[PDB]
């Protein structure tokens, strides 16, 4: 077995951690109390990636629940499937974040993380086969970017050769008005760069411009935009649950999605949000994406598609080959058969066909770029600093976040503009 | 004597094992417990069958082969498929994590931490063998066991073996079924660290053996199944003059002498016929001529390259089955007049012939065609070097910019073994060039 | 034409042999080489870490300083 285990902090970390959860147990045949209620074998060929084997045939998520505030836990307990989360994997604090990313990395979230490490150590030696980790949480509120990033950096220290996987939310003004939130983000994409082998960009400024334009939601809710989440993340781990061949575990996918270290920084998509060839433009269309860029502004330096459900292999092969002749300026050519694809026959509950698009592509600079615009605009004004510093940082610590996210982007207009010749 | 122990290194090269070892035990009448009614010789002998097969005193024959791989779930399905019977525990080693892809990670992380008892393990083969002949080793150029375990054996048993001879079975790469973007690398890394080590080498292009699968069964999608049982075809044709006895059986090594005219040049090319369907080869008996002549179509190679635009140092002919010397000499005759066959000055342009009498048999629910009478042609052409080209190209393209070159230096590499690497295949390169041009 | 005979058949094993030490020897050090290495980017990706460790000392050292 190859053992995942997974981390949420936060307020929207433990939201998303939760619907997660619930929608690959569906999937896995797995009730609220962990009791194994499915039809097919395929099932549980691969379920230790995720879940835990208590006896009396319980499986348990191989989970940790994390928030220096406990209205978010006591929520989760008694939401769907609450009942199988392992009570001792709760680790709660009381003060809370207050949006503070410095109380969430330095000062509250450093008093607490030393419980969460324990946590972690039990669920880790217990495994036959750690593949490594994978965090949920926003970068925009403070226990998930602070105390999350903190989290990081501790595990990695414990762990340095297994794989550090997140799962960032990213703030868009569209989803929420708490003015200092181009701070906290720009802090812990700071750490991100530096502390992460895969990060999947999941953008609130995409999930909400999906449910407005394309959904047709005039007030989207937090529980529209996870509804889209939920989807997203269910199909990126399709191939670490099911029985296949490519990207079957974390360290695979690493490498070969990432061609260099820093630029480890995921744009997904997905489809339907019909045909083999439908399926096949939309999930690669600018629409699709939950990372809110789009694609014929930069160049896919790598990609991952995954196919769910019944449908010619043949003419999967075929449409992919399709996608890169006919767009083949929007793909590097410096790196050969850069696009893998899988099929698994299970497809998600609700859907017939469904594809999941993993995509490594300079145009995600135009994320990092509307982050960027947005945190000097108060920077250079100074606004807010005294949350800061008050915790004990210093200003160049600003800075230096800064300089190195405007280097994140410089490093992927490189590539965008190298050729082979 | 003569015995020859097979080595199965990461998926490939274990699940190309699967199909050889059934496709023996079918040529030989082993069944999957491992008797074989025909045997009278209890518990030994010394039969040409021998070289493959071990015997136990409970009349088991037992594969002179190891399996390893770095992670367990590939073995674990010969440990309880339908051959489990035929082998002992030990000769399936697995571990329990795999290179990744990565080269560095099968060479050194992970693999240094099996590699003593995968050596024991072939000592303990090797240790039942009265006159050990040699070694035959399978495995993928672009996973990270396939290279870069298969090298860090392959320097190991020169060790323990000295010059024992080293064949191997090499998959060469193809888009339609890879896993890694990184397979260049891992396929110019195991070439340069394999390349003293080996003395001859039959790859195997996965684009080559797909496109027959498509083309000539009509299989729309291939599986590694596909491919396996066709590989398993050319793998038998080569062994059969080891297995079987014969009075035209020339000896594999033998046509070695012809094979490698330098230690470098000793990638033959592989042409296998007929490749054809139950549906259409009904009716239609292919005769020597017909299967002869479609051994000079390219279009039947294990590896896309075109000898008529290179030179031959050498051509062998194996035939199993129904096939006398006459008709093989007519068939030859007729080729030489009419096809592109232009051989280096330095060498005689005679065909070496081979002839097994035991026909081509075929596996349950496969596609092949049972036929009376087969043919896998080995060549030595300079033609060969373009599958060596278009590797290096994509390596450079990759190496350029060194993506994903952090990967193998995190594991302990540097940036000079890439290099090096690279050069030793410009070389290699050069010299498939220097052979073909003409004397002074 | 005797000592022919036996210097052919020595120099046969004195090649077998010194190939045989040759990869012996270029295996060892690649193994070493490749252990240095690895051990190297570990203990320098630890040590910066470790360097996030004294500057969350320090930053919390200015939030009680500073009060
Ligand atoms: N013909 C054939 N090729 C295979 C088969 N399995 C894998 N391959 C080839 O092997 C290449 C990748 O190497 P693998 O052998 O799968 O990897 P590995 O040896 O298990 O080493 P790891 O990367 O550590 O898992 C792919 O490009 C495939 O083309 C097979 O069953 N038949
Ligand atoms: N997509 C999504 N984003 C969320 C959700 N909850 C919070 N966020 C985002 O996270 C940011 C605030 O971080 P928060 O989750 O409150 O951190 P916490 O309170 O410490 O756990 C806001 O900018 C929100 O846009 C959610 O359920 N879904
Ligand atoms: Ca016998
Ligand atoms: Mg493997």
Redesign the interface.
Known sequence: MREIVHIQAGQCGNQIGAKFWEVISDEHGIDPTGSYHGDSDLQLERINVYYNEATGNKYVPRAILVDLEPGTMDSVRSGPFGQIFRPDNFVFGQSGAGNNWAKGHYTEGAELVDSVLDVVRKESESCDCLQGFQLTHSLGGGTGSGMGTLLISKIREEYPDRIMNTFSVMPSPKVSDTVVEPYNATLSVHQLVENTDETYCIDNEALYDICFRTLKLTTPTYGDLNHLVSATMSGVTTCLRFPGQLNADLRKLAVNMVPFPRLHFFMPGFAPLLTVPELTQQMFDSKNMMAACDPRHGRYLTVAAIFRGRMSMKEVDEQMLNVQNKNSSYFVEWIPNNVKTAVCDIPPRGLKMSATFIGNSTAIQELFKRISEQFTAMFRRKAFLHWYTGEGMDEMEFTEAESNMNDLVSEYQQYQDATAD | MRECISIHVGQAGVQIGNACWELYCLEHGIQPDGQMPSDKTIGGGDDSFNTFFSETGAGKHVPRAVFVDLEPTVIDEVRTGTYRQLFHPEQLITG??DA???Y?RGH??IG?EIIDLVLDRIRKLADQCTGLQGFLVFHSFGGGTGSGFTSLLM??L??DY??KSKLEFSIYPA??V?????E?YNSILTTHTTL??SDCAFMVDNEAIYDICRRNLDI??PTYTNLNRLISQIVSSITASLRFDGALNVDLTEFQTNLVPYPRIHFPLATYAPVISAEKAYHEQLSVAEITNACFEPANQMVKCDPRHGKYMACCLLYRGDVVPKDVNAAIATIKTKRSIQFVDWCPTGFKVGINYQPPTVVPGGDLAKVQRAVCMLSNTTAIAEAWARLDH?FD??Y?????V??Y??????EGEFSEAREDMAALEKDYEEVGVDSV | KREHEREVIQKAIEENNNFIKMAKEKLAQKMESNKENREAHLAAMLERLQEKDKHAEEVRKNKELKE
């Open positions: 329990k994590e990744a892809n990565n560095a050194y992380t240094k320097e190991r020169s060790v000295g010059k888009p339609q890879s896993t890694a973007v990184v260049p003293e080590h729309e999608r994509k393209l990759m350029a910019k060194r993506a994903f952090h990967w230096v995190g594991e302990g590499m540097e």
